[PDB]
């Protein structure tokens, strides 16, 4: 965090040297539950023959998904965050 800055415009340019479309993730770390954990963004306009790069970011939202046993792995850490939950008495 925090959301859109002048540095969005700058880490645009550095990533535009790779030159596909960018995927700007901003992980706000604030206490509140009214603050989303990570706020995915991708610029529209983004026309680029102008200054450096226009910043008007599209609404995106986030999920989890790559694998099962690794979110069994995250659930194992969720309920360790609750309270350990060591590995002996699982079943």
């Amino acid at each position: 965090g925090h959301d859109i800055t002048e540095h969005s415009v700058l880490i645009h340019e550095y990533y535009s040297r790779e030159a596909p479309n960018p995927i700007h993730l901003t992980v706000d770390t604030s206490l509140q539950n009214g603050r989303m954990s990570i706020k995915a963004y991708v610029s529209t306009s983004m026309g680029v023959p102008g200054r450096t790069m226009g910043v008007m970011f599209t609404p995106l939202t986030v999920k989890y998904a790559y694998y099962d046993t690794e979110r069994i792995g995250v659930d194992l850490i969720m309920k360790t965050c609750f309270s350990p939950n060591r590995v002996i008495g699982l079943s």
Partner: protein, 324 residues
Amino acid sequence: GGSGDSAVKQVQIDGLVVLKIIKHYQEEGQGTEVVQGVLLGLVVEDRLEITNCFPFPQHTEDDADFDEVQYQMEMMRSLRHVNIDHLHVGWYQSTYYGSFVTRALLDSQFSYQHAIEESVVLIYDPIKTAQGSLSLKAYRLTPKLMEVCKEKDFSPEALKKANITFEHMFEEVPIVIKNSHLINVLMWELEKKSAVADKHELLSLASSNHLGKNLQLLMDRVDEMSQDIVKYNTYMRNTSKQQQQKHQYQQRRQQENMQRQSRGEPPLPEEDLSKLFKPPQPPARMDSLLIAGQINTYCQNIKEFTAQNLGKLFMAQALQEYNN
């Protein structure tokens, strides 16, 4: 002080490590045991704390072949630049068939442990053992064998280091009981992703249902254990057979030949009398089974004790649930 023997404390494996292990979960090394990464950590309160790992890949086409260390050197610099340093205090092979500490894993460990005595060797065991008990198996090597250092040769120092009788049912440290203090952020995600976005929580939890119903889990465990363990059992029996025959059954014949000589010829040798016992290779105590094989008796008792338990639970639940 739960701390280990003579150079090291226990281990603590921070959750973000084990996330990165289950990313290279059980592929890139399924049917081949591949060292899937080094455990990089630091000495903390009464423990090590593995705070990060980076994976070590290899040429895994269908066999494993060791590669240039251009990977590890560049990647341990990659860690050093944004994070800490190259602080490899162990390693993890997940990998292949519920927790088993092979003779090769004992030898690779022996090279590792003698070099850096701040070490454990992890064996990350997911759903493959029917999950099951002891998902994180730690195990460091006895400092006795790091004092009767190399090598256990077939006749000398098999017998002699068997007679020293260093451990092979050796202690394994506990790994977690405490707040790791990087609980923090992942705690904050729990309230989000439970209730109002419990998609991916419930997805992970309902994995349990289909761990029971379908194709032959305990059946296949007990099947693979019907083959794995009978292999090892037969091996010790025919190993022990031949050696015990060189120990006694050959002494039996040659000493009954020593009868015939009458145990002395005064004018001249005693060539025959001398040339009785001329060494067969085991005189006693073939060591690599006695040590390293016996580490896997322990692991085979563990697999049996694991596969049993979830069976025991069903045998309560099944009867009881229907009893209403």
